[PDB]
Design a protein around this ligand. Structure first.
Ligand SMILES: Nc1nc2c(ncn2[C@@H]2O[C@H](COP(=O)(O)OP(=O)(O)O)[C@@H](O)[C@H]2O)c(=O)[nH]1
Ligand SMILES: [Mg+2]
Length: 387
């Protein structure tokens, strides 16, 4: 502990070598700075996992650089990556997009990019692979344009992005000329990836779960400080639902123990000055003053479960009106489907425009669930906010 910890993963097109790279990384690193070398298969045969209520196939691996310690995840199929990205089951302070030099960019390449940004993947590094299969100076540089430029197409610094050329293969077999790229690749994670923003540091915030009124000199709302800190005296905004209202944090108690400040991650009951129980309700949230606005219309990438996992058994259509759980509650919304799209089948993902009846404190990257009679039928992340 203190050894900086970073969470990464290999994204990219199928067979482009995400997994093959993953391997090479631990190995190359084990041999060099000591550690544990992992076998392709132990990685290709991915166990499942259950997050937010779904089933993904994910392999978790570890390896260390000097200064840092990395947490790494590599998926089997695009979907796993899809689900994982949208849910966030596995976090990614950066991503190792994997591109083969024999195919150039591919649909999925795009997709994963598309998602990463949409989902708050802050940083992404690139390993041009299978370079062993290509000896064409000129060809390579074309790819970098194809890329640095596709990259910029989705709001990432294409012209400022690292691109490690290599052969995840040769390096896995033991061809030293090639290992250094894993090394070159590694170094980048260390220098290029800024240690993340911590939760406690991030802006203060708290989803209101319950609301009471004791004594009779101020009210008490409960819920988990999702982020930032809250110091008694720092005012707050109660955003969501009805017009926003202001107040001041008068008391912090966690199990009858009187305290002076709430930290991201703790469950607390905050005492507010001059606000009534009828002026506050679940769904709303305690947030540093001005750190978030409420909306009703938003663009989001969404996934509908299957029958096997427990989701709807049929498709749904426009004018569909399910519910959307946000941290603490459900809100009915109207669905708009991309041009072309006419019905969503269970097991599909679609960028879909939802329209809620009430306002909800929100910002891009938020994840929600979709439900029916309180049953979960899908999940999403607010890609972009509109209204
Ligand atoms: N020639 C060559 N083949 C490679 C290299 N890296 C991976 N491959 C091959 O590419 C295929 C797919 O690689 P893989 O890592 O499984 O891609 P994935 O489907 O994204 O996981 C495998 O059969 C590997 O042997 C490389 O550096 N050179
Ligand atoms: Mg694979």
């Amino acid at each position: 502990r203190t050894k900086p910890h970073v969470n990464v993963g290999t994204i990219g097109h199928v067979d482009h070598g995400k997994t093959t790279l993953t391997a090479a990384i631990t190995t190359v690193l084990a041999k060099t700075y000591g550690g544990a070398a992992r076998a392709f298969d132990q990685i290709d045969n991915a166990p499942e996992e259950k997050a937010r209520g779904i089933t993904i196939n994910t392999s978790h691996v570890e390896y260390d650089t000097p200064t840092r310690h990395y947490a790494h995840v590599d998926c089997p199929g695009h979907a796993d990556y899809v689900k994982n990205m949208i849910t966030g089951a596995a976090q990614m302070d950066g991503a190792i997009l994997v591109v083969a030099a024999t195919d150039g960019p591919m649909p999925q390449t795009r997709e994963h990019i598309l998602l990463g940004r949409q989902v708050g993947v802050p940083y992404i590094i690139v390993f041009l692979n299978k370079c062993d299969m290509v000896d064409d100076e000129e060809l390579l540089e074309l790819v970098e344009m194809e890329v640095r430029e596709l990259l910029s197409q989705y709001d990432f610094p294409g012209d400022d992005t690292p691109i490690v050329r290599g052969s995840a293969l040769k390096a896995l077999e033991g061809d030293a000329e090639w290992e250094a790229k894993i090394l070159e690749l590694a170094g980048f994670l260390d220098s290029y990836i800024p240690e993340p923003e911590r939760a406690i540091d991030k802006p203060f915030l708290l989803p209101i779960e319950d609301v009471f009124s004791i004594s009779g000199r101020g009210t008490v709302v409960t819920g988990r400080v999702e982020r930032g800190i809250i110091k008694v005296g720092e005012e707050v905004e109660i955003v969501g639902i009805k017009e926003t209202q202001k107040s001041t944090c008068t008391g912090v108690e966690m199990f009858r123990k009187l305290l002076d400040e709430g930290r991201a991650g703790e469950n607390v009951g905050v005492l507010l000055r001059g606000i009534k129980r009828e002026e506050i309700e679940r769904g709303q949230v305690l947030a540093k003053p001005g750190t978030i606005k409420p909306h009703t219309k938003f663009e989001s990438e969404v996934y509908i479960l299957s029958k096997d996992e427990g989701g709807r058994h049929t498709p749904f259509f426009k004018g569909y009106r399910p519910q959307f759980y946000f941290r603490t509650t459900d809100v009915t919304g109207t669905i708009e489907l991309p041009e072309g799209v006419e019905m969503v089948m269970p097991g599909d993902n679609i960028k879909m425009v939802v329209t809620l009846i009430h306002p909800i404190a929100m910002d891009d990257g938020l994840r929600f669930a979709i439900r029916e009679g309180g049953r979960t039928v899908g999940a999403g992340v607010v890609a972009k906010v509109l209204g």
